[PDB]
Design a protein around this ligand. Structure first.
Ligand SMILES: O=C(O)Cc1cccc([N+](=O)[O-])c1
Ligand SMILES: [Zn+2]
Length: 257
């Protein structure tokens, strides 16, 4: 099955998921000089005051912080979006070293990591129906750079020892994702896809310009996770990022001048 190795990594995904070579794949390089300011874009509305995290999961590809999405409790609206998108999970992608890890790039710059907050359009009723629609998901992407610690991330880092290997989960209630957000909500937006199989072309991407800072210690704890299951040969969970894909017939729009 798919993964991030030599034998099963991104460059192989098209054989089981031919949409890998589609017209609206993610991530992409954001060329800041050609992304056009669009005055018609709105401010993003991120409303996470009632977000109810439940659990953290090592799925063998990353770890997922999961939310109760059975009501409108943590929603993303505005920005480029029509309608209301409910938070279902967040996860990250990161590198073996601080010089790579992000999926999106900015003028070819790779960040140490990238956080994805995944939301589904309530007009489709559930996540599985939403991913079948071109406007089914909104993913908020936030770059991580290594410097100062992010106090709001520490609760996540400290639970990782308990989900070292694939298929482990742990209760993870009361975590507030507002602690992961940068000061500015300036963004770039474009139409794209999931970045892991099945690579469905169902995402409005909203990539924040301003990175968050996390400490080296924090990212080092991400890199102690395992792709493998309990008791199998240890292969560290690192470099779980898809590289930039062809932009094709897309425009990247900026919310800011
Ligand atoms: O389980 C999976 O890998 C598919 C999946 C599910 C939810 C979000 C995703 N994304 O690319 O942001 C991908
Ligand atoms: Zn992701």
């Amino acid at each position: 099955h798919w993964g991030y190795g030599k034998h099963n990594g991104p460059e192989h995904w098209h054989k089981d998921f031919p949409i890998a070579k589609g017209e609206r794949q993610s991530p992409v390089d954001i060329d800041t000089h050609t992304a056009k300011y669009d005055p018609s874009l709105k401010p993003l509305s991120v409303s996470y005051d009632q977000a109810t995290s439940l659990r953290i999961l090592n799925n063998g590809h990353a770890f997922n912080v999961e939310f109760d999405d059975s009501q409108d409790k943590a929603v993303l609206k505005g920005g480029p979006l029509d309608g209301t998108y409910r938070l279902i999970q967040f996860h990250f992608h990161w590198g073996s070293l601080d010089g790579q890890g992000s999926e999106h790039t900015v003028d070819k710059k790779k960040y140490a990591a990238e956080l994805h907050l995944v939301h589904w359009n309530t007009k489709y009723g559930d996540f599985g129906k939403a991913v079948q629609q071109p406007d089914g998901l909104a993913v908020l992407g936030i770059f991580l750079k290594v410097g100062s610690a992010k106090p709001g991330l520490q609760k996540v880092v400290d639970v990782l020892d308990s989900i070292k290997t694939k298929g482990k989960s742990a209760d993870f209630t009361n975590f507030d994702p507002r602690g992961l957000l940068p000061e500015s909500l300036d963004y770039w937006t474009y139409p794209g896809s999931l970045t892991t199989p099945p690579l469905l072309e169902c995402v409005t991407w909203i990539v924040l310009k301003e990175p968050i800072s996390v400490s080296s210690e924090q990212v080092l704890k991400f890199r102690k996770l395992n792709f493998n299951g309990e008791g199998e040969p240890e292969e560290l969970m690192v470099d779980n990022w898809r590289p930039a894909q062809p932009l094709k017939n897309r425009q990247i729009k900026a919310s800011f001048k």
